[PDB]
């Protein structure tokens, strides 16, 4: 899957609304602030940052990545992104009680309920939910995600990735 190029423009505090995290000697988006330079260019939780301003991110720590952003010179920051490489999609169907079949806490799937659609479809635990029927749920309270599910209809398509 080919990477893509984005050019961000800093806000007033020299920030772009982005938190990053080192995973397996790569750099990944950990949080994207709403209505930020990062959201303007379509960054999402789980996107991989391959390069910043012409430097490869391979092997950088979280602290280094944050420092490079904070210190970035001028008002424009260039990045090359591999769109969330660990993403998978699972489609489930609600049962007669309105459930798809998993336990959820602090943004993580923690258990799979027996005899459910989640079980039939091989949903995994220690995974975060990124989207529900296309809607970002990263950073939402568990109760807000419950709200969303209540109005999603019988078909529930989620994007997930390992929590790492």
């Amino acid at each position: 899957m080919d990477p893509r190029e984005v050019i961000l423009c800093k806000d007033q505090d020299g920030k772009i609304g982005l938190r990053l995290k080192s995973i397996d000697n790569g750099i990944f988006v950990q949080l994207v602030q709403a209505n930020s330079p990062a959201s303007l260019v379509g960054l999402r939780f789980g996107d991989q940052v391959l390069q910043i301003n012409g430097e490869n991110c391979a092997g950088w720590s979280s602290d280094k990545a944050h420092k490079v952003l904070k210190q970035a010179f001028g008002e424009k920051i260039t990045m090359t992104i591999r769109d969330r490489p660990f993403e998978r999609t699972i489609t489930m169907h609600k049962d007669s009680t309105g459930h798809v079949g998993f336990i959820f806490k602090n943004g993580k799937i923690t258990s799979i309920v027996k005899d459910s659609s989640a079980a039939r479809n091989g949903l995994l635990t220690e995974h975060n939910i990124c989207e529900i029927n296309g809607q970002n749920v990263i950073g939402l309270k568990d109760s807000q995600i419950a709200d969303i599910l209540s109005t999603s209809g019988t078909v529930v398509t989620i994007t997930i990735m390992p929590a790492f």
Partner: peptide
């Protein structure tokens, strides 16, 4: 404080 979905 676990939710059942």
């Amino acid at each position: 404080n676990e939710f059942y979905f």
